[PDB]
Write a protein that binds this ligand. Structure first.
Ligand SMILES: Nc1ncnc2c1ncn2[C@@H]1O[C@H](COP(=O)(O)OP(=O)(O)O)[C@@H](O)[C@H]1O
Ligand SMILES: Nc1ncnc2c1ncn2[C@@H]1O[C@H](COP(=O)(O)OP(=O)(O)O)[C@@H](O)[C@H]1O
Ligand SMILES: Nc1ncnc2c1ncn2[C@@H]1O[C@H](COP(=O)(O)OP(=O)(O)O)[C@@H](O)[C@H]1O
Ligand SMILES: Nc1ncnc2c1ncn2[C@@H]1O[C@H](COP(=O)(O)OP(=O)(O)O)[C@@H](O)[C@H]1O
Lengths: 136, 435, 436, 445, 442
């Protein structure tokens, strides 16, 4: 049970509190990734990462993690950059669509070989939880 | 009604225009030299020019160090920041102690911002959007008890209006500078469309639709540091449920601090921001480790470090984290060479009696003079704090027998019920099995 | 509510005092200790007045001499709606929170905000529900005949009330409460209609009720910190709440207090076995006791001239002298034969045990010989030995059989010192073989 | 601005000649001729850049000018050369090892320099016309951008159309487009349309309309340290780890591929290498493991010049149970060269006090300066330095502008040094808590 | 050109089928240790044994790290070499046992070879040919896709599956771009746009890779060199997946985890299966640990366990202590800070100090590497200086001498410059004498 006073005077904005003003002052006006005031840092980070949009850092720094995970798109990056291809990412990339009996795919398919060898897709379930409850 | 807790009879330092202390003024009795030194320190802080100055005030227990620190904070006013701290708070289980010390250092530098609040609030009487699949702008009509007013709005605020499920007849709240949209509920003119509905019904606003207000925002530098150093990302305006993965504190790099300083230095020159340095007060400084004592030397040499005020009540004491470093006040000699030491002297009988009378006045109790002499004798015999904490049981025991006034027998009864440390030690020594 | 089998202090219902704070010889389950009970009554009047804050009271004495009993009596005589946080000394050495942060949370759990508010409810008995539905579910129409024992009415229902009545299916014969503003409908049950079971409500259908909420400062601190939700009040991962939101709550609480929208209630923070705290905890308490939003802290300990933890010297009661300067001390005393007999009689009446007189004298003699808690523990074992031979009253030989079966401290020390060759010493040397 | 009067802000560079000969008083430094000459030699070693992995040690008594010399070296180093100044207690972390913290501190002190060209088209959008074909596989764009002086019509590609549909501009926003790289940004909205929408909203900002030439050319220079590349090539979005410090024990394979690729970039001619200085103040409280890692990590080609400062005598080393000179093991002291500072006399203390009084904008008389010089002869120097600042306020309370001897005497009586505090503690030892926790609280026996 | 305390040594300098000569490869003296290190290098090149341990011991400034780096240079760049410090094993993310096992698996390499059949170049036409009898209820049923490719000196029209057109649409392959199709998988990827289609629009973001050389179709044999730790961290972490856990962990901090023995066993058995097929070669390498006195007895015990493994590489340990207590124990007196259990399992190589002529020759080589010119009398005085104080102190006093010579507008170091460098920069002994003879917290 929560009273209406805390919710009214602490969460939602009204005429006597400054929630929205402080939120805009903290998240927009004094943000260090703002291109209207920190264009040099944005250009430096664009050279570092190779991102073609200078407003991307503002978008990344002002979004929740799960939402950033959900609408992640594999956009292209320019070649003239300092972020290059680390070797394990290349090993991850060559086995994306590789078929069986290829040497890199077979060296990269340990877990599915263990799944298909140990007959794990016909095994039973031995544990169930005792209580299942919704959030409070 | 009013709550008193070991203080709040202290209103300030009680100095005149020339900086000379009065004897009994501002709730302070005696202690001329330490009050004059604290007034000089207050003037230096009000000068707003020097960074990294430090002050250590030392003396016996129950002498007035924390009272002098609170008097400094009251003399500065509520506009100047003041961060009180204990030496045991620097040990955390999420980040290193140097990060906590740097965060508490940057918590004491503030900024004053001039801002405006613009508010439209009323009944929605017309909600017409127009395009050119993508809307161009929406005309919103608002009505209050003093009249109507029409507005044009961008599609961004229209998306938040539609997200809030605003229809014709709802009382809304639109902030012009931030774009925040709040829905209050349906109006009482539409309360009879059904006999039973789930909507809450609010009356029309009595005042005008358009309101303007001048406001002043105070923000510390640690607020601007923590507003940009979120590891998970930004959060929404309204969230009663937290994020699924727990965000812990992290060691904030100096590059973010430099960029925050660059932004603040750009904003100061335009006249939007005003910079105010403040005070970092650390009581019980003898609880600090030698590593924090070393990092304090580097932190006091920065360009933006505030005025630090320390206190200690020890003698020649071994520094924690070391084995054979005997030093005064538990402070290593490297940091003492950067310090200025203010001594605190103990009190005599008449000052103890005056302090007891002053505390009895602010607690709204009436004491007989013969009881006051007994309380002063008890304060000199055992402790000033023991005499101060025995006033409320005396008041309760006087109120028990329907009296508004303290008698000597109440003092004797309260002395019989409650003991000090010395009599407890005497019972402890001449005992058989664990008291 | 509040399920409980039998506790060690379950026979204590409060401090037995008159209107002049004088202790009765036997009242509310507490006997003996007149001066300590009077001092705790004065402390109770301090808490009930609420005009002073941050006063520390130390309860010190021998073990098994009415300390936790006194704290339980103070907590029972405080009543409900006043915060009481009873923690132990070893509960603050956490792995995700620092010691000062855990102590700050335990301090702020003991100050409450009292807020009174009014809401309107429709509590009634459903006579008839009529639902008109379309093919595609576009427009719904609804009639609701609902009544009390005093009135009767029919309501036209809108679409969202139709959706809220279809969900959480309400049939005829039910008793329900409807909130008009939030749309929360609760089934109280079924009425008295044989054709669970509750009584049909009386009076007006649309009632307006005032509810009183007591919210701790720690709850508002958790809510106002945007990094975590209110579920950290239940899951427990608050995780080092910053001081800025504490400053905002401390300003807003005084702002509400000045405007008269809320009230301040102070509580009691009880720290049982306070000698197990570290020196950094005492240094934090020395400055945390001087806040305006500070409760009354009662600490209980039984050590005498022991080593302070975190240091290498010895101090009285295990506490440093700067903390002991900031405290007033209530001292307990050992019990006599008559008070031990009265305590054992009260514990006999509590556990529904019927005792003979000579068994009570034997229990009193072995209580003043060995311990109070040993005779308080034998009294329920002897009842089971009595019930094994099928009789209700516990006799003398029933106490003697339990005395023979179950040992005490001194006899165990005597037998261990007699046959120490069969046990593991400090050096780890044992003899398992019987011969040679 | 955001810089107050610090402890040593009067030091602007090292006061040397063109033949590495120190002046008696220039650029804020007074005295210490041999230490300043050695620091000039180390400065020339850094500016040469052909050497790597050298360890010096500034050893001296407290209040002598070791960190003053380090500040002078940092000020005379110039811009765009990395100078990483840390203390001894910074490397003890809860989620980073001491070896990894030292590795990050080492790789923060050597950077690479990259030059690039920018062709900026910055202006206010007037009208965007999108032409779509019948097949729809290719699209064309007519862009009308403007300045206060000239405007023109630009042709767009389909990737322009996709990149402007995202972060969508609304015909009156200020953008800037690159030609060589195609960088797209939305700076905000013009002030000409500020009175249009009656409420701005959350995600908008107002900028001035750009003027002058619409086309601009500019060459910019970037200095990126190796730690930035290490952090960036360790995650997906790594700049948040750059600004929050949650990098968390970056592996060695990415470090060696970054070393190989930066060697390849130096060989190709795209970038060049700028070595820098890593300063460790109060080096005496590091563990023996950190010293082991340091004297192994001083032997790499990508290692900066390490300046360590200490003031301990023959004291114990942390992590062990024996004493060593300067608190450092002899294995580390083998691979080092020591600059030794010397204590000051009356004249140098007088000159330093005069410089510090000039820097703080405090006017003194001759007698007050002589009294402060005598006090700094008897006591330390920092006590007189603080005495100047408090005597200025005591002077200004008297409605007097210059500091007199009365004000210095009053500031001397009000604030105590170390020796008088030790004497007052030792005379009144019963009123303080000693090492055994004993204290006489009461004033009566 | 950067010189840093090394890189004057180019291998050990032995001749074939014989012993070390007196001066070769940047080495002066130390004949027997060089011969022993050459025998160890030949044993490593024999590529048969596993888990052999060498501890080389001696005083400070003797050349243990120089000998280890000479071994690393003598093996070459294709054999793995993992340098390490004993203080690096203490991590606050995972236990030190897992760090030691990771550094063990980092030192073993796998050389794999493969053949790729590719079709790349600029697209000339892209026509999805319809079928003769389309099915009802559908649209544009495709029988095959005709793609024409053009490169340098070669054009060729292809005939594809109906399936790949979906990948062409998903990868946004228009006309005029340069594509890349491998044979067995399909999986067209868009490598860029041709440079002949660069200047029809004023503004664009897409890069312009030029036309590829050679024919459109060529089989290329590639050779890739990995380590076993790379395979372990690639199989342990998941691939590109559609679950929320995989995308959430990819945006979070890469926290190290305790790799199980099951994954290592599966990796070793699949590696052995492909080695027996004749495709993969196994190259064991060297794991070098400097200052092994920093290890405590738990890591020593796990070293005792792990040196008896089937796959473990050659471990080279360096230490300079004498009779010292092992860390983590209070009363165990041991040589070099190494417990006798590990001492029994290794071979010890002893290194000897130098004399005056060898010090002079080493100073001569370090001067001629740093591009410096030294006078002969100044060289003799520097050799005397190195005899009196330290070899490393004489080596580190060369660049201040060169700078002071340059400041006087000369190109040669003289006696006065080395006297000025003597007076300006101190050594350990004179600084200790200054500390002992002063009483002002010096
Ligand atoms: N000069 C004074 N006038 C009035 N009250 C005083 C004076 N000095 C001390 N007190 C009171 O005595 C108590 C001493 O507390 P405090 O100063 O915190 O102890 P300590 O000096 O050990 O920190 C305070 O409650 C304060 O109100
Ligand atoms: N005055 C009393 N009235 C009733 N029971 C008491 C009284 N004093 C002690 N007891 C009983 O004695 C036992 C020991 O009391 P307690 O205070 O919990 O031990 P300790 O003093 O070691 O904390 C308790 O179970 C309590 O029921
Ligand atoms: N040669 C110098 N010229 C000017 N000021 C100096 C000089 N040497 C020391 N100081 C001053 O002395 C003060 C303290 O000396 P510091 O550099 O901290 O010595 P240390 O680092 O040995 O403690 C500094 O504020 C610095 O400005
Ligand atoms: N035989 C040698 N020939 C040439 N230089 C040597 C020789 N031995 C040692 N050095 C030089 O001595 C310096 C320090 O020796 P180092 O390998 O560090 O010994 P340790 O590892 O035992 O401390 C190195 O820079 C190296 O160039």
């Amino acid at each position: 049970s929560l009273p209406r006073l805390i919710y009214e005077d602490l969460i939602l904005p009204n005429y006597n509190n400054d929630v929205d003003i402080a939120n805009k002052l903290k998240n927009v006006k004094f943000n260090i990734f703002n291109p209207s005031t920190n264009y040099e840092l944005c250009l430096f980070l664009s050279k570092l990462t190779g991102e073609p949009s200078l407003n991307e850092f503002f978008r990344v720094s002002t979004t929740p993690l799960l939402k950033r995970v959900i609408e992640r798109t594999n956009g292209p990056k320019n070649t003239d950059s300092l972020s290059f291809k680390t070797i394990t990412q290349e090993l991850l990339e060559v086995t994306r669509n590789a078929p069986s009996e290829g040497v890199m795919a077979s060296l990269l398919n340990v877990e599915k070989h263990a799944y298909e060898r140990e007959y794990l897709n016909c095994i039973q379930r031995g544990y169930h939880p005792n209580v299942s409850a919704p959030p409070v | 009604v009013t709550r008193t807790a070991a203080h709040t009879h202290i209103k300030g330092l009680g100095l005149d225009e020339s900086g000379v202390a009065k004897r009994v003024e501002g709730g302070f009795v005696g202690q001329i030299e330490a009050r004059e030194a604290c007034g000089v320190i207050v003037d230096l802080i009000k000068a707003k020019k020097m960074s990294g100055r430090a002050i250590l005030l030392a003396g016996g227990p129950s002498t007035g160090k924390t009272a002098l620190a609170l008097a400094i904070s009251q003399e500065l006013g509520p506009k100047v920041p003041f961060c009180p701290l204990v030496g045991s708070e620097l040990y955390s289980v999420e980040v290193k102690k140097t990060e906590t010390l740097m965060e508490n250092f940057r918590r004491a530098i503030g900024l004053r911002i001039k801002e405006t609040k613009e508010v439209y609030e009323g009944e929605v009487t017309e909600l017409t959007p127009e395009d050119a699949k993508t809307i161009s702008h929406v005309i919103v009509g608002l009505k209050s008890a003093k009249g109507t007013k029409t507005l044009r709005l961008d599609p961004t605020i229209y998306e938040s209006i539609q997200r809030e499920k605003v229809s014709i007849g709802d009382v809304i709240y639109i902030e012009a500078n931030t774009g925040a949209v709040k829905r209050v509920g349906r109006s009482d003119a539409y309360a009879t469309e059904f006999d039973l509905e789930t909507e809450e019904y609010v009356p029309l606003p009595k005042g005008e639709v358009h309101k303007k207000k001048e406001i002043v925002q105070d923000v510390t530098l640690h607020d601007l540091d923590v507003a940009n150093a979120r590891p998970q990302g930004g959060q929404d305006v309204i969230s009663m449920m937290g994020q699924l993965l727990k965000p812990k504190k992290t060691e904030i790099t100096e590059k973010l601090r430099q960029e925050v300083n660059k932004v603040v230095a750009k904003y100061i020159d335009q006249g939007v921001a005003e910079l105010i340095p403040g005070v970092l007060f650390i009581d019980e400084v003898n609880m600090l480790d030698i590593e924090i004592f070393t990092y304090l030397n580097k932190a006091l040499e920065s360009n933006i470090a505030p005025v630090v005020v320390l206190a200690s009540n020890r003698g020649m004491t071994t520094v924690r984290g070391t084995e054979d470093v005997i030093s005064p006040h538990g402070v290593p000699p490297d940091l003492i060479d950067r310090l200025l030491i203010v001594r605190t002297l103990p009190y005599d009988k008449d000052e103890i009696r005056t302090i007891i009378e002053r505390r009895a006045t602010v607690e709204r109790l009436q004491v007989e003079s013969s009881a006051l002499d007994l309380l002063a004798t008890m304060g000199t015999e055992t402790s000033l704090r023991y005499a101060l904490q025995l006033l409320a049981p005396c008041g309760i025991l006087a109120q028990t027998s329907n009296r508004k006034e303290i008698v000597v027998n109440d003092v004797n009864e309260a002395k019989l019920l409650f003991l000090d440390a010395k009599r407890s030690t005497k019972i402890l020594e001449t005992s058989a099995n664990y008291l | 509510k509040s399920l409980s089998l039998i506790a060690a202090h379950s026979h204590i219902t409060g401090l037995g005092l008159d209107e002049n704070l004088q202790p009765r010889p036997t009242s509310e389950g507490m006997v003996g200790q007149l001066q300590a009970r009077r001092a705790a009554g004065v402390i109770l009047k301090m808490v009930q007045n609420g005009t002073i804050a941050g006063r520390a009271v130390l309860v010190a004495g021998p073990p098994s001499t009415g300390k936790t009993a006194l704290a339980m009596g103070v907590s029972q005589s405080l009543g409900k709606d006043v915060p009481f946080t009873a923690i132990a000394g070893s509960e603050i050495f956490s792995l995700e929170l620092s010691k000062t942060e855990a102590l700050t949370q335990a301090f702020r759990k003991s100050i409450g905000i009292k807020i009174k508010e009014e809401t309107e409810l429709i509590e009634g008995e459903v006579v008839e529900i009529q639902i008109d539905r379309s093919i595609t579910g576009g427009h719904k129409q609804g009639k609701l005949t609902i009544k009390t024992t005093d009135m009767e009415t029919i309501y036209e229902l809108g679409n969202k009330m139709i959706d809220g009545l279809t969900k959480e299916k309400v049939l005829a014969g039910d008793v329900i409460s409807i909130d008009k503003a939030s749309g929360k409908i609760t089934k109280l049950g079924r009425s008295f209609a044989r054709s669970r079971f509750v009584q049909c409500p009386e009076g007006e259908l649309q009632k307006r009720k005032t509810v009183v909420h007591t919210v701790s400062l720690h709850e508002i601190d958790v809510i106002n910190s945007r990094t975590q939700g209110f579920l950290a009040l239940f899951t427990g991962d608050t995780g080092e709440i910053r001081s800025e939101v504490r400053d905002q709550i401390n300003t807003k609480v005084a702002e509400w207090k000045e405007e008269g929208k809320a009230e301040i209630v102070p509580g009691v923070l009880f720290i049982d076995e306070v000698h197990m705290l570290d020196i950094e905890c005492f240094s934090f308490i020395n400055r945390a006791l001087e806040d305006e939003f500070a409760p009354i802290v009662m600490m209980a300990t039984n050590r005498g001239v022991s080593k302070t933890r975190g240091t290498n010297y010895k101090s009285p009661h295990g506490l440093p002298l700067d903390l002991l300067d900031r405290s007033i001390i209530i001292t307990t005393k050992s019990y006599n034969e008559q008070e031990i007999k009265t305590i054992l009689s009260i514990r006999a009446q509590e556990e529904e045990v019927e005792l003979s007189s000579d068994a009570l004298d034997l229990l009193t003699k072995t209580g003043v010989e060995t311990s109070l808690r040993y005779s308080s523990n034998l009294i329920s074992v002897a009842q089971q030995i009595a019930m094994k031979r099928k009789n209700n009253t516990v006799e003398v030989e029933d106490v003697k059989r339990a005395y023979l079966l179950f040992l005490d401290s001194a006899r165990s020390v005597k037998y261990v010192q007699e046959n120490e060759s069969q046990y593991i010493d400090d050096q780890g040397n044992v003899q398992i073989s019987i011969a040679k």
